[PDB]
């Protein structure tokens, strides 16, 4: 089986999500044929030289999955688009493009983060075009770390003071790649949408964000599974209910 996760939005202020991800990496992920992380692994990223200890803890845990024989892949999200080759080397992850076509046990599957499908949010698309401009990225990454931190903290507060996908963009993407299956995240609306692409039925599978519990897509030769699970091992106990 091949696993897909996304939108964990890991951050030191949310240690429960981190604990749930580490348990996932130590258990479920060790049995997979491959693990794909479709963006927004971290709530924020300002460059691979960031000494944030969470980054090294996550890198080491993913690297242990890679060392256990499970190749791990990463497509950038809108939050962590600055994840680069240094962190890829530290984690053992392979960085992929914003769109990839996979062959999963015979079925062709398109994967992406999903933010490029929200073509109706012109405000976000302007921000995305800005921070994806290569000379702007190089200029920001050259700034001192403490300056990048203050910029990011202010820009996050400015944003606090998610649009769904455009149906035709979905069709266009699935017909550009000639697939009947699409997996993405970003929208935080886990679902399986049926549609038509290339004159045949097609399905758009959406991952969930790790807010209260975990979420993953498991692809087997026989089916596609959208699975919700708790962060930690909920040890069962009994309460003496009465008839």
Ligand X SMILES: CC(=O)N1CCc2cc(S(=O)(=O)N3CCN(c4cc(C(F)(F)F)cc(Cl)n4)CC3)ccc21
113 is in an annotated binding site: yes
Give the span between the Cα atoms of 205 and 140, in whole angstroms.
34
Interface contacts to Mn ion, rule CB under 5 A: 7, 40, 77-78, 186
159 is in an annotated binding site: yes
Give the span between the Cα atoms of 177 and 171, in whole angstroms.
10
Neighbour order of strands in the sheet with 224-229: 94-95, 72-74, 34-37, 2-5, 214-219, 224-229
Q: Which of ligand X, Mn ion, none sits in contact with 136, Cβ below 5 to 8 A by type?
A: ligand X
228 is in an annotated binding site: no
> Whose Cβ is closer to Mn ion: residue 78's or residue 91's?
78
Nearest to 167 by CA among 130, 117, 208: 117
Q: How far is the CB of 189 from Mn ion (least distance, A)?
A: 11
91 is in an annotated binding site: no
Q: Which of ligand X, Mn ion, none sits in contact with 77, Cβ below 5 to 8 A by type?
A: Mn ion
Interface contacts to ligand X, rule CB under 6 A: 44-46, 78-79, 82, 124, 127, 131, 136-137, 140, 151-152, 155-156, 159
| 175, two tokens | 């017909």
Neighbour order of strands in the sheet with 107-111: 100-104, 107-111, 181-184, 200-206, 191-197
Q: How far is the CB of 165 from ligand X (least distance, A)?
A: 15
> Whose Cβ is closer to ligand X: residue 127's or residue 203's?
127
Map tokens 């892949």 to a residue: 73
Give the H or E element holding residue 115: none
Q: How far is the CB of 195 from Mn ion (least distance, A)?
A: 21
Nearest to 61 by CA among 97, 20, 98, 33: 20
Q: Which of ligand X, Mn ion, none sits in contact with 208, Cβ below 5 to 8 A by type?
A: none
52 is in an annotated binding site: no
Q: Which of ligand X, Mn ion, none sits in contact with 112, Cβ below 5 to 8 A by type?
A: none
Nearest to 103 by CA among 31, 178, 28, 30: 178
Q: How far is the CB of 140 from ligand X (least distance, A)?
A: 4
The binding site consists of 7, 9, 40, 78-79, 113, 121, 159, 186, 188
Binding residues for Mn(2+) are 7, 9, 40, 78, 113, 186, 188
């Amino acid at each position: 089986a091949t696993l897909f996760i996304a939108d964990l939005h890991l951050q030191t202020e949310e240690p429960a999500i981190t604990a749930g991800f580490l348990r996932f990496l130590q258990g479920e992920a060790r049995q997979a044929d491959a693990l794909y992380i479709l963006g927004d692994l971290f709530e924020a990223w300002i460059g691979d030289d960031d000494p944030n200890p969470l980054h090294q803890q996550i890198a080491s845990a993913i690297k242990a999955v890679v060392d256990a024989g499970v190749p791990c892949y990463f497509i950038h999200g809108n939050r962590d688009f600055l994840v680069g080759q240094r962190f890829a080397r530290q984690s053992g992850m392979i960085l992929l493009a914003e769109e990839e076509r996979l062959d999963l046990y015979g079925r062709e599957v398109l994967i992406m983060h999903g933010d490029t499908l929200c073509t109706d949010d012109q405000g976000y698309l302007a921000f995305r075009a800005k921070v994806h401009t290569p000379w702007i990225q190089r200029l920001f990454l050259a700034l001192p770390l403490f300056i990048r931190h203050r910029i990011a903290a202010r820009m996050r507060a400015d944003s606090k003071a998610i649009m769904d996908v455009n149906p035709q963009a979905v069709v266009d993407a699935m017909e550009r790649h000639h697939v009947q299956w699409l997996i993405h995240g970003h929208t935080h609306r886990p679902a399986v949408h049926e549609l038509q692409a290339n004159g045949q039925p097609a399905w758009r599978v959406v991952l969930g964000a790790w807010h209260s519990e975990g979420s993953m897509v498991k692809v087997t030769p026989d089916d596609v599974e959208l699975i919700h699970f708790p962060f930690l091992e909920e040890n069962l106990y009994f309460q003496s209910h009465h008839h």
